[PDB]
Design a protein around this ligand. Structure first.
Ligand SMILES: [Zn+2]
Length: 316
């Protein structure tokens, strides 16, 4: 209704700032800022008062005042007159960017000597890892909720590469762990030409995974192409997306680069067709506002030998 909330510029590395108000029309003795973390809910709000009238009702803000937590904080300001009358001012928000681990799995199966050992995580160990997420308040997301990474507690993306049939084991584990509190979701990056192939997810598997609300079915190209070395970008990137959309009935907005192989040319081609692209560069993503950063997203590799302790250290 009146006034404008501003704050000293922050970056993704910032932990604090100072809030100010300008353009106030009423005469005030005090401004009260009601602040809460979106992720924790308005019911958890506190109110912080400034009587620094000569300094635009300056209010120091530090994430230390909110248990060291980050993400989006909502701000509602009211003014107080000398006689105590309250005056509605305005609302805004400030976001301290949260890190987002993007986990990379391949096979979820008991290894029996067939295939590349490191790329197998047993269903038992996968369950233990997912149970860790469940027990520690992580919010599992898919790229349809990219806009929510700062609006939830402990955002994390569980992803699988290739569309192996054994990923139905991961699906079943997630169905088991799902309950009134834990709402798991995950991304499957499907080698699109392998739908219904021996060893891969079938059309019926994909429909079950998608219809359950658990899986977001995204692209791993048409043939798992070494993108810097191919020229058929429409076939590998565009037509794979289109074919997969016809199968799932849901938008395809994300891809994973086969082998983690990517260069500026590949990013530019990918940008034509996908909003999101993940690499195999190790680490957690954070929003830096860097050019095409969402098409160069780091991932955390899970190994055959990864323990729950190692898993926890790599995401926390
Ligand atoms: Zn792959």
């Amino acid at each position: 209704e009146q006034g404008k909330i501003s704050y000293n510029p922050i970056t993704h590395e910032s932990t604090n700032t100072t809030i100010h108000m300008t353009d106030i029309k009423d005469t005030l003795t005090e401004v009260q800022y009601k602040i809460w973390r979106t992720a924790d809910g308005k019911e958890t709000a506190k109110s912080l008062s400034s009587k620094e009238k000569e300094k635009q009702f300056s209010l120091p803000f530090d994430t230390k005042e909110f248990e060291g937590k980050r993400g989006e904080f909502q701000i509602e300001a009211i003014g107080i007159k000398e006689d105590g009358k309250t005056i509605p001012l305005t609302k805004s928000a400030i976001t301290f960017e949260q890190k987002v681990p993007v986990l990379m799995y391949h096979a979820i199966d008991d290894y029996h000597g067939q295939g590349i050992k490191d790329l197998f995580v047993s269903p038992a160990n996968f369950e233990a890892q997912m149970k860790y997420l469940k027990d520690n308040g992580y919010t599992l997301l898919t790229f349809e909720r990219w806009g929510d990474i700062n609006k939830v507690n402990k955002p994390i993306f569980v992803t699988f590469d290739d569309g192996m049939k054994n990923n139905m084991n991961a699906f079943h584990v997630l169905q088991k762990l799902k309950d009134d509190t834990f709402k798991p979701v995950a991304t499957e990056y499907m080698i699109v030409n392998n739908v219904d192939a021996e060893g891969s997810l079938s059309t019926s598997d994909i429909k079950e995974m998608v219809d359950s609300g658990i899986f977001s079915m995204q692209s791993h190209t048409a043939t798992h192409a070494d993108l810097p070395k191919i020229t058929n970008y429409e076939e590998e990137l565009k037509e794979s997306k289109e074919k997969l959309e016809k199968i799932t009935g849901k938008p395809v907005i994300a891809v994973a680069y086969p082998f983690g192989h990517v260069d500026d040319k590949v990013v530019a081609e990918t940008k034509k067709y996908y909003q999101f692209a993940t690499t195999t560069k190790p680490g957690k993503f954070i929003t830096k506002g860097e050019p095409d950063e969402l098409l160069k997203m780091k991932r955390v590799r899970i190994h055959h030998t990864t323990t729950v302790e190692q898993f926890a250290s790599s995401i926390k």
